[PDB]
């Protein structure tokens, strides 16, 4: 049983919720600069 899933209705939230969170995160990331930097971390937000 993959991920403890025995009913196919359980897959709907497990896949769906990360999609919506990724949509919000993708709006955030599209707001960003997104070019390479030479440093230990990116100070641009």
């Amino acid at each position: 049983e993959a991920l403890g899933i025995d009913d196919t209705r359980l897959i709907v939230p497990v896949i769906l919720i990360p999609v919506i969170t990724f949509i919000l995160y993708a709006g955030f990331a599209s707001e960003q600069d997104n070019e390479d930097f030479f440093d230990t971390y990116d100070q641009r937000r």
């Binding site: 209705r9 939230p13 919720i17 969170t21 990331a29 971390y41 990116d42 937000r45």
Partner: protein, 35 residues
């Protein structure tokens, strides 16, 4: 018991998704020495 299981799966997925996509959101920049 299935309704409780799907509610718990939804809640765990929601909070783990928030955790995962929050630490992907340039968490290293969120420090007082930035800029």
């Amino acid at each position: 018991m299935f309704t409780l299981k799907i509610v718990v799966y939804t809640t765990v997925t929601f909070f783990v998704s928030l955790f995962t996509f929050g630490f992907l959101s340039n968490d290293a920049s969120r420090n007082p020495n930035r800029k």
